[PDB]
Amino acid sequence: AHHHHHHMSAYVIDAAERPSVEVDQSSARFPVRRVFCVGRNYADDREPPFFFTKPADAIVPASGTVAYPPLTNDLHHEIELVVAIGKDGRSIDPADALSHVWGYGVGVDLTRRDLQAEAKKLSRPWDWAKGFDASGPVTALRAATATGHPAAGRIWLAVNGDTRQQGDLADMIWPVPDVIAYVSRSVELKAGDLIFTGTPAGVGALQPGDRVTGGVDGIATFEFVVGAKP
Amino acid sequence: SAYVIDAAERPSVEVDQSSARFPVRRVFCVGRNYADHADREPPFFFTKPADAIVPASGTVAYPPLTNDLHHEIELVVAIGKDGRSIDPADALSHVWGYGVGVDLTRRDLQAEAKKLSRPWDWAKGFDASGPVTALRAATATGHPAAGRIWLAVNGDTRQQGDLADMIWPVPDVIAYVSRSVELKAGDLIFTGTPAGVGALQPGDRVTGGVDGIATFEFVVGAKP
């Protein structure tokens, strides 16, 4: 009958716990592989989307304190629906794309916007602007079997109780199945991938100490405090 | 932790003469950091995902969405000690060891990203975009300040320079990264590439090295 004995590698230095996200109503977690983020994907002859990434360990809890990073005086927020992938694939047809989705959460794409403007002026990479520490707070994830595949509903963010972003998932330019398909034509998509699917209007700054709340109806809400400037 | 999906093995790199591995945390890559010889502008950086680090051995896949896959040979520094705002005088104490790597680029996508002032992730952070040799501890290699760095294709040199050509040396590169993010044990830093511009096509045999560190060979796989 079936048997196996898997052996784990030893490491020459201490290996930190691999990055993962809390799962709602579970003690198991979601291990993060890569993080893909769509450029401008909300609206009020579509051009193809473009993408940047964040490192897996930039995904932190959207709760407690979220550190204010060094090298910025201009930290911006963008509320986004986050899609968690549960099945590998390349060149995925949009009609098959949702079958690759494990579940959903709510995230904030944080940006060092001053560094971003400098990068844009110089045609230089956005990694300092977009892929810094704690640059992708995300809520606990819910399995798609619990939520369905959301396609409509309120997506919002407030700062100190004042609404700064409010839109609807239905206003996505490229829907989730097409976003998945596009990423899968650039790299092999893998179980463990997260995709930040874009943000409605109202991107703006966060000050040290700000209380950030937000949510996507039926998926999650969150509340966290921005840390002190280093 | 238990996981809701199967987790693939975390990315790591071979260590010379050991069965233990070097676990990769993040991968930083400095932009233009070599002169053709010998008021420096500060360096800039891009990154690659940890699992873009693959062996500089066997076959390296040719990626989709390109007709123009470029090579840039680099010394790779492996970090063994966390730090933020590291002083250049303390930087080498954070180094676990060294290897040799190739920054591979979908250069056609990079050209379009530059034209549009858009992110470089598709150009630079794709699958198998950072082949690296086995690593050696700094206790064994020392901290190299000079030495030939080179890459050949089918036996013909395509890049050549010397580590002494670096604009910002390793201690300063470490210091700069540590001011943007917390540097961690497990990080890899690609430290720049010498002169020579070249592309690779399926079946090309890529060799290269840094004197005193490591050499490598791999073949480029079929276009998908």
For this experimental structure, what is the resolution in angstroms?
Answer: 1.4
HEC per residue, chain A = CCCCCCCCCCECCCCCCCCEEEECCCCCEEECCCEEEECCCECCCCCCCCEEEECHHHEEECEEEECCCCCCCCEEEEEEEEEEECCCECCCCHHHHHHHEEEEEEEEEEEEHHHHHHHHHHCCCCHHHHCCCCCEEECCEEEHHHHCCCCCCEEEEEECCEEEEEEEHHHECCCHHHHHHHHHHHCCECCCCEEECCCCCCCEEECCCCEEEEEECCCEEEEEEECCCC
Neighbours of B69 (CB within 10 A): 23
Of B115, B180, B186, nearest to A132 by CB-CB distance is B180
With an 8 Å Cβ cutoff, are A28 and B84 in contact? no
The four Cα atoms A41, A201, A126, A80 give a dihedral, to 10 degrees, of -70
Cβ neighbours of A131 in B, within 8 Å: 47
Give the gap in angstroms from C-alpha A107 to the nearest C-alpha of chain B.
19
The four Cα atoms B55, B57, B62, B67 give a dihedral, to 10 degrees, of 110
Of B5, B44, B127, nearest to A125 by CB-CB distance is B44
With an 8 Å Cβ cutoff, are A15 and B23 in contact? yes
Give the gap in angstroms from C-alpha A216 to the nearest C-alpha of chain B.
22
A149: CB partners within 8 A, 6+ apart:
A98, A101, A176
Cβ neighbours of A52 in B, within 8 Å: 119, 121
With an 8 Å Cβ cutoff, are B3 and A20 in contact? yes
Write down the CATH number for the domain with range B1-224: 3.90.850.10
Q: Residue ranges per domain, chain B?
A: 1-224
- Give the Å distances, CA to CA, from A8 to B2, B5, B7, B19, B29: 15, 18, 13, 11, 29
Least CA distance to B182: which residue of chain A?
Answer: A133
**Adjacent-strand bridge partners of B150:** B160, B209
> Rounded to whole angstroms, how far apart are CA atoms B204 and B155?
10
Contact between residue A227 and residue A68 where contact means Cβ atoms under 8 Å apart: yes
Write down the CATH number for the domain with range A1-230: 3.90.850.10
Cβ neighbours of B1 in A, within 8 Å: 17, 20, 28-29, 31
